[PDB]
Design a protein around this ligand. Sequence first.
Ligand code: CYC
Ligand code: CYC
Lengths: 183, 183
Amino acid sequence: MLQLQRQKIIQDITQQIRSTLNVNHILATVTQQVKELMQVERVIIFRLFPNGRSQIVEEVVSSEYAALKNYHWEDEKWSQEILDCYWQGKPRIVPDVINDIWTSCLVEYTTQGNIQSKIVAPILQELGENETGRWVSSEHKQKLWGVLVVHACSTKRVWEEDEAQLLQQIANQLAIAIQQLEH
Amino acid sequence: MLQLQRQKIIQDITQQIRSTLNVNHILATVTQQVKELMQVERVIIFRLFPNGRSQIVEEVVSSEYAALKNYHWEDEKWSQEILDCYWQGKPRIVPDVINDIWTSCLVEYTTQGNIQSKIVAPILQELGENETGRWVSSEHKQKLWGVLVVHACSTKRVWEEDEAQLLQQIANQLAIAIQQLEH
Ligand SMILES: *[C@@H](C)[C@H]1/C(=C/c2[nH]c(/C=C3N=C(/C=C4\NC(=O)C(CC)=C4C)C(C)=C\3CCC(=O)O)c(CCC(=O)O)c2C)NC(=O)[C@@H]1C
Ligand SMILES: *[C@@H](C)[C@H]1/C(=C/c2[nH]c(/C=C3N=C(/C=C4\NC(=O)C(CC)=C4C)C(C)=C\3CCC(=O)O)c(CCC(=O)O)c2C)NC(=O)[C@@H]1C
């Protein structure tokens, strides 16, 4: 019968639930919006795992340039001066990545991605209680879940304060949303 | 300048985040869909708190009938036979609420809501570890968060198995979504 039409919305409703409630769908939607809004050739999310691994988990490329999605690496150590900056929730403006000494090794990765300049915006979990790893601070009582990056590949783009100021405000809203959807 | 247009999407993006991530917005949207789909005059969510309190937290009424939103009560005890049924994740079809012995006291509430017949669908949290209250089971290792109800007020409506079968499938999808958004 038309008991058939009962389930053409249950598959809708279940769709909206699993949609809104899995993290990746709201990563892939935010990133797509940051990309279109800042007219940036690439937006990525760099996920930092405590064991030392780290992977590009979402990316939204201008089709001109490579897909660095899923790109990865183990035992990721960052420079202490850099991590102090990102722990305080401050972004980073890298107006020339190729002569940036902190990204002096991601030159394979730099040259493929075609990155000239970029803004790096930390994503911070207020994680209290007991957890410790490679990306966790005792001074600032927060863990660095990962990093929202924006890539300017076609030109050595100059960035404004309120462009980075803005980015960080968007990551800081992912910090909250991620603390929620981890099971 | 047009730095103005930077923030006419940050207020958008923040909107989608706080939207999708607060529980009530996805309660109020599901209930509105259950109402329109089953052509029921009222849909409510009965929230059961462990201390004994209990309140109608969402409701979507056919404007003809009262707003039982926010309706409430303390030290809510249910009949043991009834709770056993709901713990196993089984709905309940009350084809005549007025001579239902289990709802023999909600007759103030019955007479205002104009309820003739109704389907009650439990919402179950797989909550392990250590928590105990008035709505928690050791036999079934699950807590009764609350209850999705549908009200047939204009007529003593007859319900189908796949109407209740269906309801329960929708609550069971809220069970998962709620376990996620509790901070
Ligand atoms: C070299 C000085 C050290 C380092 C720098 C560093 N990396 C990032 C962020 C990223 N790290 C990677 C991945 C890699 N780490 C590697 O060591 C290698 C191999 C060469 C790879 C491929 C990636 C993809 C990123 C994100 C880069 C991006 O901009 O899209 C940072 C943080 C961001 C920044 O530029 O400030 C830094 C400082 N990481 C190390 O492990 C080296 C000791
Ligand atoms: C009376 C036998 C007992 C009882 C029955 C019972 N109530 C519900 C669900 C609801 N309980 C309320 C609220 C009230 N509980 C009260 O004791 C009073 C005062 C009279 C109120 C107002 C509400 C709003 C509900 C939801 C009702 C709905 O159908 O919309 C149930 C579960 C649902 C069912 O009908 O099977 C039951 C069994 N609860 C008690 O506390 C009494 C001992």
